[model samples]
Target chain A: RSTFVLSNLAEVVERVLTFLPAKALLRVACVCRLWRECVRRVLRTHRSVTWISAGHCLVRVVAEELENVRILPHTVLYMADSETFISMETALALEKLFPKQCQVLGIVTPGIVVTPMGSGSNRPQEISGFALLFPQIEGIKIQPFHFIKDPKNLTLERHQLTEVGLLDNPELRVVLVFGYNCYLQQVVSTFSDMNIILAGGQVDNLSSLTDASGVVGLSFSGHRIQSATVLLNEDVSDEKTAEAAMQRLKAANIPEHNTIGFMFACVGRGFQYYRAKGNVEADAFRKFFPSVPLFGFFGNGEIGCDRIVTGNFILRKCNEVKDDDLFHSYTTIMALIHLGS
Target chain B: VFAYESSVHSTNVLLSLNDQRKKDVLCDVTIFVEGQRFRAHRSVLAACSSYFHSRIVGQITLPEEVTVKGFEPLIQFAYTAKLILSKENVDEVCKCVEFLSVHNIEESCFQFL
Candidate 1:
């Protein structure tokens, strides 16, 4: 096996420089005469724009600006059983096995460290905690863990199989894996050296929660989901569930004219659970305040609860909202509305 | 040389090209203000095509050089766009518009003026 050394780094740099064009080489010359002469033979070319079409949305990057644009399609996935799970071996060899058909297009490589409190690289990890789940690891720390081990006077709350704890004060955010097969997750914050836990679930839910709280985007596994569940509190009836959903939208202060929302549920949510084809979206839209724009896909696993879970982050176009606009969607809705001039 | 600005919604505005060269080269530029106030422009005044086809239309000068060809149904997607070139020299233009009913350019056709 060839070792990656400093010489290899130098060679990679040389190759990149050699690919520059004449005009680019001339620009480099301004840095130094020697560099200009060395790179003058190289030419600069236009950077390629990647557009990824996956999930229920069509995502494209503007060729000239690299701006991200997403389009919602009429068809959406509705169940987890419909999705196929690949072995870790097969998943790792995906690129080599499908060399001709596979393309990296617009994917952000994993390994870019994501720490809590928004401090770290912005790029994605090539193989993330979610990717490591095939081997049944409790949780892999793709980045650093900054929370204290033993927290004091913490209030622990349990929901189904998930758990939550509020700390007196915390200095950092760290995602923890629990239960066999690492099916559960918890985000811990060390406040005054006390630990606070937020939501968790199987690899999918934990990943989704991490992405939600950390403001990361989601990644799709290209699996067709077939069976799933939509969970609501036992105390609420169908009518109350719909009403409460609307209250959530109103509390979020969704404004008319520019408000947008999306609904993600289990396959059991649509006509299978309610009635009609667009029942899920329709119900949410009816109760949604301001009747803002809404669209969504039924996912393989329904991600809910308050603990950090595992799954892809729901990606959104950055800084695309207007001052008077409010955007809402499942899991990772970002409200970037301007408050004042 | 035409411009419309809205102080309430600064991004919502209308623009037209009226320079002699622009007018001569371009058939006409029509900015349609939808009921919601979103502005859409059709420059070439070409025959109508389906909505999907209109999404991927290239510059009127070079339609054949499109990076991705749209679906067959989208071939007939209708809308107006700026046409700086004519079909006589552009085989692709004639082929694209052959399925349409009418394609022409004239003055006073724009609703903005």
Candidate 2:
């Protein structure tokens, strides 16, 4: 009170601030030093990097990496690349990991998966389920969808179009499809016009599905999200991986500034087929699109039809990257989506 | 009958006390604030104000931090039990009221604005 200003009682200043709207608090900060400090404690900066995780234990790895990133994305792509239990309990563990926001969805699959170490020093996690995070890009919209049906309804109501923006005129929708073979086919057959990147795991090799069938897919739509899906043959081992990546990406006439890229390799192709180096494909991706983010998983099947394939001791699809192309061994489905522009 | 209290009994006592102080009837103390003096009864000041009953309220130099004009309204508030505050004078009023430890300002009158 000696200074004859209201700033003397700090307790009242903070209490009074709560009476104002949060928007008004920003302006209140300019009024005093104490006021500015109160505002600073609650402000959070926007996230700029993708949160990708791959640790041996499925739940712990996904949970730990989420803490480092510290927020939720509209969509999370998660799956065990091999046939395993990680895919079954996924939806349960995810409940505690993110806040109660239903707009968020995650796909958990079994087998070989990808992860980011989050730091330059953390050991790369092997034998894990992959989880890739996607923030809400300004114009791009993500609708993460799944279907559970009693056999016939699997195809009967398969379109699930209400969640999509166009559902697309078959113009600009890229769907990342995941499921076991039967449900996989039913879901794939329902989409006629959209570009689909598929993944299917087998049982005895795949058991997450019981008598009631279901499918999980991340559906991306909007003019801002440009896409190019490419399937690399398991036979292309002789070519430099970077050149193979570069050649296909250029031939696709991919526009500049690809926001993210994904790789689905056959479980048969990694480590054994690529000189035993796991990152060769990932390293090759950056040689061409240097700044883009890339996530991959080795699937029982890599889904994408080929644009052009000469012969190799390899695998093959067809004349274009279509929804139903499924390769059981030694193939890689690569996709690039341009997000912001 | 001699000792009974009406619903407005406390209010009437305060109203009559404030009127007596204004007329300077039986006023026993001259409280100096900033550069002005207010005539008030010591018992009214001590009974209604924590600062007046305080062990710290003996004799000392009068505080000069407050504006003298801001002192008059609160002296009336101690006997009258009412405080008139406006945005125009709230900052000044709170500053002086806090230092003097006057009470009952928080039927906080800003609701009128």
Candidate 3:
């Protein structure tokens, strides 16, 4: 009787595979041996399909019924196994299937509940709030993973630090700073998609803050501000934070036109810890670095790090590549670049 | 599983197992046409089932002249069609015939007779 049941199960398994895509099959293989052989025999070759901007779960659709499906970077897979996380062997096999692609695959031992946040409400906004929406805390797990299995032919630095010629470009002197830390360098590298990283130095006050303690400091210098719009303070004032940021630029001894004097405030500020509307950026631009253009939106969180800009930390060690300098930051950072001369 | 006897242009084709064999026996062309291509003597047909099996396994097409009257007439028209497998394709021509029979296309040109 048991033998008959196993044979019948194999038949059912084959039928189920006919419906699933290739990427899903790889995940299914990690479940058991019967499933693994089914995939090995059915597939002829491996291929990859990319999903643009749509989150990680969508990747399962691409792998259905096909042989081996490769995933590009930023693919997310989260399941319910606290004890049994994604194994390195599975990662290596995935690498062979989709050579040189980056993706995220998370599988918990069993399964987890997936609740979609309403549109406009970013999916990962409140980690703590999720406990309320889902009562089964023991069954529910959220493990974020990122994959950089395949990189483009030409390798770029994972992180970069650069110096701008202040006299040649006026925007750097009068605008916001932006930068990033990347794990895998793109082959046909483009500046638009790179992650943003902010400088961790100058604002020594951040060291005292519990949440921002992991930040590392770096040295910088720029020209003095001529007009005042924002100011930096030693307190929790937004203006004070902005002032300290600008001072770092001035200390860098930046060219006259490249000195930033003003910046716009956004939604990320004006909260419980630091209460003020654009106060931090406003004071910095007004007092220390005047005449700089500052513009940004206030939101639940801010994205900037030396390497990559993601809602969560995806890479273990991020690298940076710029025209002139090399940079590496352990925490979230942003950059301030000169638009053009 | 059905067999029918028919005759074409009456030409006495000789049979032998090897090309070097000088002795020849006049075999009926009708039986020869119906005979399994694989079983046919290489001495007479110059090739047999095994010969065509290896050649046709991965090939996309084969010359019709080797089968029923060069497949020129079949290729001229366009409709969803598949190459008809035959004994000339393999030693077990019967098995190949069974496969084709299962997927019978209504437009298959050849008559059972």
Candidate 4:
């Protein structure tokens, strides 16, 4: 009989990181120097120029300053003004922009996270485009999916189980679906059994596939990526309730080397939403994850998986409405992504 | 007229069966766990393992690579009805449990993940 000793406690526990609504990510440093040097880069850009000009600038920045290792998953979250968001030129250029082919999801937002605190512009020429680029890393895979309104009906009132298909061998991880934000009430029901974190915003459309009432984006799967999604209460005349929700994401114990934050906030949570300073949600975000780079936008409806709805946290009376999951009122739908080694 | 003839009698029987096997008083079969001799009652093992139910049971020798320690703790769960899984041995013990098709505890193993 051989008696074995476990040298590293983290190694054994690391194998079975508990799954999250999205999931919370915490990772130890890597063994070899090779892993540290070949680290995957997460790039986020907020440009306030015209859509064409912003697109050209993004291409130049990537090809010149940001060329690095490429592969499995690179997510580009394009949140821009309406015209820039739906521009055929903007949608078509994603292939040229990522080249190695990343999952690109674009949404139209009256307010985008431009400054560290908060910023907004609804005008056509004064366009603001936001992008978050994630390169392929170990223990991660990005799968692209979308669903549209029924052809015969052109309506989304019915369940979308008939419209959207199943994700083969899917894990209930984070899948950001941008567009027709209102219908995710139906979209979420479609994947009822899956319990996947169906997130993203109510933008007009995503790259190449120009449809208003559909969703298209990426799902981050495998062991290396951990995500936890929380929906704040509908009491958004203040930030205290949203601050309480941020506490759970903090309990996740935080990151490997690469962790990013996405705040798919409601339009009612920002400064005007606060009846005070506009950046309460944005400012509160940096307080929690000071080092991690952040990007997100404000839309009419923001969809998030209500995993941390415990403690009577997600207190919306969806009971009045048929689909109670739309705790999507004026609360901040916060998702914290942790990438482990 | 209500006689609740002691609820733990079945547990007493299970424990007694375990003792007999351990004392080598009623063992009906010999197993060569990776060539190390281990004695057990055939009926008890057959009841717990589907692998044991097939025709032609054993003077069985598990392969050399399958360590004696790996199979013992899991197989003993039949008699002892107690299974302990720790980090060091969990990986080894789980493979043995899966290979042997041991009952009940097989389903509990995955939920830890």
* Per-model CA lDDT versus the true structure: 0.25, 0.54, 0.28, 0.53
A257, model 2: CA deviation in Å? 5.1
Give model 3's docking category: incorrect
Winner by DockQ: 4
> Fraction of reference contacts reproduced per prediction?
0.00, 0.00, 0.00, 0.00
Q: Write the per-residue lDDT of candidate 2 for residues A1-341, one digit (tens) a residue.
A: 64444467665666666555434655677876776775443322222335555553666766655545533355554555444443445555665565444354444343453435453222233345555556555545666665665644434442455545325333334666655433555555566334433333331122222124455556665555555556567555743854665566645544555355666666666667766465666656666655555655566655555432111111123325444455345677667655544
Candidate 2 residue A109 Cα shift, in angstroms, is 3.9
Superposition error at A329 for model 2 (Å): 4.9
Please provide, for model 2 over B36-82, each residue's C-alpha lDDT reduced to its tens digit, 9 standing for 90 to 100.
66787877887766767673356422567777566666776788765
The positional error of residue A81 in candidate 3, measured at the CA in angstroms, is: 38
Writing each residue's lDDT as its tens digit, candidate 4 over A1-341 gives 11121223433333322221000221212423322222211111111111121423343433442323222225555566554344567556655655345565555666565432112222111124555545455555555556665557644443333223334433335666666534555655455345355556665455543254665666666544555566665654466755655665565444524655667776655656566555666656666665554556676777664542111112112234434554365666666665555
- lDDT of model 4 at residue A39? 23
- Candidate 1, residues B68-109: lDDT per residue as tens digits? 122121222222123322223234333344433223322111
Q: Which ten residues in a row have the lowest lDDT in candidate 4 chain B?
A: B104-113
Rank the models by lDDT, top first. Answer: 2, 4, 3, 1
Model 2: CAPRI class: incorrect
Highest-lDDT candidate: 2
Give the Å error, residue A26, model 2: 15
In model 3 chain A, which range of ten residues has the least summed lDDT?
Answer: A126-135
Please write out the lDDT profile of model 4 over residues B43-87, one tens digit for every residue: 888888887765325546676556777787776778877665555
The digit string of per-residue lDDT tens for model 1 on A1-341 reads 13343224544544655655333444555654445444533322211111122220111111211122111111111111112321233233322321232221111211111111111111211111111111101121112111212235233233311212223212212222211121111322221121211211222211111111111111111111111112233332355555554454343322343221323333233444433333433444444433332323333222232111112111111233221111111222112111010
